[PDB]
Design a protein around this ligand. Sequence first.
Ligand SMILES: [Zn+2]
Length: 232
Amino acid sequence: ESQPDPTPDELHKSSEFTGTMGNMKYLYDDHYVSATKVMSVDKFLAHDLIYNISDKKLKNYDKVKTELLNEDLAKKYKDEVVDVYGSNYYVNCYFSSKGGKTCMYGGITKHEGNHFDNGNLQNVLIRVYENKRNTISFEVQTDKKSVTAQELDIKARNFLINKKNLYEFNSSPYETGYIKFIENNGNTFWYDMMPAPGDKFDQSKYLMMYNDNKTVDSKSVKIEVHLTTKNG
Ligand SMILES: [Zn+2]
């Protein structure tokens, strides 16, 4: 059930990536869509939901479309009152053709029953390993009991870009990186933090890993960020 951890050879290497690492940084550096109590208004493909959500900080969109793994997830949430949290993109964001528009994947949670009885916020510790040493540890926060892994991942990388220079314009000071979640039923899963090898970063394709809408229990999940400089 749980995903095996990284094999050494499969992790993406920043030395094999020849595009602009600022195109990855852009997805996580104080950049996310956020909304409360919205209900989808429209669809494009059978697995996606379009919401009326307005860009809260820069004035770039009044529509957002999320793509989900399958038509079942889309039906489940179509008429639910939901909260939205996730990373958006504009390159190759295909809508029909019928006030900017932005795209994304997953990020949706039912609002009702999903907040803490106190109105308080749940702190979630991220432990950071560099060349296998737990170097620093820091907390992100959420108001949600059952929170997307996407939302936690975005918060963690936002911090690390400022604190650790996780991504810079040209490249990264790290060669490899993966973020691992560990749930209190023992389940584990992880996301490669580095772009696929090549001379072009594909935003849409990279973000597509969040389409499963995976949620985790904020009060109990543990998170590990594992980074190497290993090459230099
Ligand atoms: Zn809510």
